[PDB]
PDB file of C-alpha atoms and ligand atoms in Angstrom:
ATOM      1  CA  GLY A   1      -0.149   0.499  -0.027  1.00  0.00           C
ATOM      2  CA  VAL A   2       1.220   3.279   1.109  1.00  0.00           C
ATOM      3  CA  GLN A   3       2.486   4.772   4.041  1.00  0.00           C
ATOM      4  CA  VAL A   4       1.235   9.122   4.473  1.00  0.00           C
ATOM      5  CA  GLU A   5       4.285  11.110   6.891  1.00  0.00           C
ATOM      6  CA  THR A   6       3.570  14.499   7.212  1.00  0.00           C
ATOM      7  CA  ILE A   7       5.832  17.192   6.851  1.00  0.00           C
ATOM      8  CA  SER A   8       4.437  19.599   7.264  1.00  0.00           C
ATOM      9  CA  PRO A   9       0.844  20.400   8.088  1.00  0.00           C
ATOM     10  CA  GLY A  10      -2.560  20.425   6.254  1.00  0.00           C
ATOM     11  CA  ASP A  11      -5.426  23.244   7.356  1.00  0.00           C
ATOM     12  CA  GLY A  12      -6.441  19.904   8.497  1.00  0.00           C
ATOM     13  CA  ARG A  13     -10.222  20.428   6.643  1.00  0.00           C
ATOM     14  CA  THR A  14      -9.840  20.714   2.714  1.00  0.00           C
ATOM     15  CA  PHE A  15      -9.081  16.698   1.608  1.00  0.00           C
ATOM     16  CA  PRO A  16      -9.300  15.996  -2.057  1.00  0.00           C
ATOM     17  CA  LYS A  17     -13.109  14.447  -3.538  1.00  0.00           C
ATOM     18  CA  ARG A  18     -12.576  12.504  -6.737  1.00  0.00           C
ATOM     19  CA  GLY A  19     -12.827  14.520  -9.957  1.00  0.00           C
ATOM     20  CA  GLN A  20     -11.127  17.370  -8.583  1.00  0.00           C
ATOM     21  CA  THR A  21      -8.232  18.513  -9.680  1.00  0.00           C
ATOM     22  CA  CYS A  22      -5.092  18.202  -7.417  1.00  0.00           C
ATOM     23  CA  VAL A  23      -2.079  20.674  -8.186  1.00  0.00           C
ATOM     24  CA  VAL A  24       0.923  19.232  -6.482  1.00  0.00           C
ATOM     25  CA  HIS A  25       4.926  19.827  -6.450  1.00  0.00           C
ATOM     26  CA  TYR A  26       7.013  16.440  -6.240  1.00  0.00           C
ATOM     27  CA  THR A  27      10.493  14.781  -5.777  1.00  0.00           C
ATOM     28  CA  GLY A  28      10.892  10.868  -6.604  1.00  0.00           C
ATOM     29  CA  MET A  29      13.108   9.125  -5.334  1.00  0.00           C
ATOM     30  CA  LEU A  30      13.851   5.841  -4.884  1.00  0.00           C
ATOM     31  CA  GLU A  31      14.653   3.214  -2.262  1.00  0.00           C
ATOM     32  CA  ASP A  32      18.106   4.334  -2.209  1.00  0.00           C
ATOM     33  CA  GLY A  33      17.207   8.332  -2.138  1.00  0.00           C
ATOM     34  CA  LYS A  34      18.325   9.007  -5.555  1.00  0.00           C
ATOM     35  CA  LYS A  35      16.344  11.168  -7.217  1.00  0.00           C
ATOM     36  CA  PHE A  36      14.736  10.234 -10.521  1.00  0.00           C
ATOM     37  CA  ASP A  37      12.517  12.996 -11.445  1.00  0.00           C
ATOM     38  CA  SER A  38      10.712  16.562  -9.669  1.00  0.00           C
ATOM     39  CA  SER A  39       8.654  18.848 -10.564  1.00  0.00           C
ATOM     40  CA  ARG A  40      10.830  21.225  -8.460  1.00  0.00           C
ATOM     41  CA  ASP A  41      13.773  21.411 -10.652  1.00  0.00           C
ATOM     42  CA  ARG A  42      11.192  22.301 -13.122  1.00  0.00           C
ATOM     43  CA  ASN A  43       9.544  25.449 -11.153  1.00  0.00           C
ATOM     44  CA  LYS A  44       6.202  24.068 -12.870  1.00  0.00           C
ATOM     45  CA  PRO A  45       4.026  21.749 -10.592  1.00  0.00           C
ATOM     46  CA  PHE A  46       2.227  19.253 -11.780  1.00  0.00           C
ATOM     47  CA  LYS A  47      -1.813  19.054 -12.524  1.00  0.00           C
ATOM     48  CA  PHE A  48      -4.186  15.438 -12.306  1.00  0.00           C
ATOM     49  CA  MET A  49      -7.625  14.866 -11.068  1.00  0.00           C
ATOM     50  CA  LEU A  50      -8.425  12.285  -8.323  1.00  0.00           C
ATOM     51  CA  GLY A  51      -9.468   8.917  -9.896  1.00  0.00           C
ATOM     52  CA  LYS A  52      -9.025   9.378 -13.320  1.00  0.00           C
ATOM     53  CA  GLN A  53      -6.344   7.278 -13.077  1.00  0.00           C
ATOM     54  CA  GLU A  54      -4.032   9.337 -14.731  1.00  0.00           C
ATOM     55  CA  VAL A  55      -1.131   8.824 -11.648  1.00  0.00           C
ATOM     56  CA  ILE A  56       0.669   5.525  -9.654  1.00  0.00           C
ATOM     57  CA  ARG A  57      -1.856   4.207  -7.074  1.00  0.00           C
ATOM     58  CA  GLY A  58      -0.308   5.259  -4.371  1.00  0.00           C
ATOM     59  CA  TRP A  59      -0.521   8.523  -5.791  1.00  0.00           C
ATOM     60  CA  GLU A  60      -4.891   8.529  -5.814  1.00  0.00           C
ATOM     61  CA  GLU A  61      -5.239   6.933  -2.108  1.00  0.00           C
ATOM     62  CA  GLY A  62      -2.249   8.256  -0.492  1.00  0.00           C
ATOM     63  CA  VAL A  63      -3.235  12.828  -2.377  1.00  0.00           C
ATOM     64  CA  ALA A  64      -7.124  11.666  -0.785  1.00  0.00           C
ATOM     65  CA  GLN A  65      -5.844  11.536   2.057  1.00  0.00           C
ATOM     66  CA  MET A  66      -3.568  15.021   2.879  1.00  0.00           C
ATOM     67  CA  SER A  67      -5.287  18.622   2.989  1.00  0.00           C
ATOM     68  CA  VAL A  68      -4.930  21.195   0.753  1.00  0.00           C
ATOM     69  CA  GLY A  69      -1.687  22.724   2.648  1.00  0.00           C
ATOM     70  CA  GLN A  70       0.179  20.509   3.641  1.00  0.00           C
ATOM     71  CA  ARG A  71       3.388  17.972   2.407  1.00  0.00           C
ATOM     72  CA  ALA A  72       4.040  14.371   3.358  1.00  0.00           C
ATOM     73  CA  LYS A  73       6.215  12.040   2.289  1.00  0.00           C
ATOM     74  CA  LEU A  74       4.794   8.799   0.810  1.00  0.00           C
ATOM     75  CA  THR A  75       6.483   5.827   0.520  1.00  0.00           C
ATOM     76  CA  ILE A  76       4.182   2.947  -2.103  1.00  0.00           C
ATOM     77  CA  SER A  77       4.950  -0.472  -2.991  1.00  0.00           C
ATOM     78  CA  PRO A  78       5.130  -1.573  -6.289  1.00  0.00           C
ATOM     79  CA  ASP A  79       2.390  -3.442  -6.807  1.00  0.00           C
ATOM     80  CA  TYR A  80       1.047   0.278  -5.803  1.00  0.00           C
ATOM     81  CA  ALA A  81       3.366   2.041  -8.974  1.00  0.00           C
ATOM     82  CA  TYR A  82       5.618   0.094 -11.552  1.00  0.00           C
ATOM     83  CA  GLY A  83       5.450  -3.685 -10.583  1.00  0.00           C
ATOM     84  CA  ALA A  84       7.180  -6.582 -11.884  1.00  0.00           C
ATOM     85  CA  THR A  85       7.871  -4.724 -15.041  1.00  0.00           C
ATOM     86  CA  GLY A  86       8.810  -1.017 -13.448  1.00  0.00           C
ATOM     87  CA  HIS A  87       9.771   0.538 -15.864  1.00  0.00           C
ATOM     88  CA  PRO A  88      12.939   0.356 -17.751  1.00  0.00           C
ATOM     89  CA  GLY A  89      15.839   2.965 -18.092  1.00  0.00           C
ATOM     90  CA  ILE A  90      13.696   4.653 -15.153  1.00  0.00           C
ATOM     91  CA  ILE A  91      12.189   2.758 -12.070  1.00  0.00           C
ATOM     92  CA  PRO A  92      13.572  -0.866 -11.870  1.00  0.00           C
ATOM     93  CA  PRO A  93      11.694  -3.609 -11.465  1.00  0.00           C
ATOM     94  CA  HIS A  94       9.727  -4.576  -7.651  1.00  0.00           C
ATOM     95  CA  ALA A  95      10.865  -0.779  -6.410  1.00  0.00           C
ATOM     96  CA  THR A  96       9.139   0.856  -3.614  1.00  0.00           C
ATOM     97  CA  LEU A  97       8.545   4.768  -4.703  1.00  0.00           C
ATOM     98  CA  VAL A  98       9.662   7.850  -2.288  1.00  0.00           C
ATOM     99  CA  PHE A  99       8.001  10.385  -2.828  1.00  0.00           C
ATOM    100  CA  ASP A 100       7.322  14.376  -0.754  1.00  0.00           C
ATOM    101  CA  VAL A 101       4.373  16.211  -2.217  1.00  0.00           C
ATOM    102  CA  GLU A 102       3.077  19.447  -1.854  1.00  0.00           C
ATOM    103  CA  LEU A 103      -0.475  19.756  -1.888  1.00  0.00           C
ATOM    104  CA  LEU A 104      -0.421  23.605  -2.986  1.00  0.00           C
ATOM    105  CA  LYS A 105      -4.212  23.997  -4.423  1.00  0.00           C
ATOM    106  CA  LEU A 106      -7.307  21.821  -5.446  1.00  0.00           C
ATOM    107  CA  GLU A 107      -8.795  23.119  -8.179  1.00  0.00           C
TER     108      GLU A 107
HETATM  109  N1  LIG B 201       4.901  -0.607 -15.281  1.00  0.00           N
END
């Protein structure tokens, strides 16, 4: 599954609902701490509509537990990320991923 650890609290009241667009900043890393992707480096927030499976399952389920303004560390198991096949060249097979995610706003 996905484990959500708070780094900084959000408002503790506004939680993403299916169909809303989540605007976040994130940094993805492999178990060893090696960064593989980051919207922060591109200085451009990432957007995705909750429930449309435009992102890995661990995000859909983990971000739904965050409130607006919150920054959290999500630890995601392979089955909730890229599985046995992974994404050759970037994500190895059976990789557990760690994401530092900040929920900026909802649209
Ligand atoms: N995959």
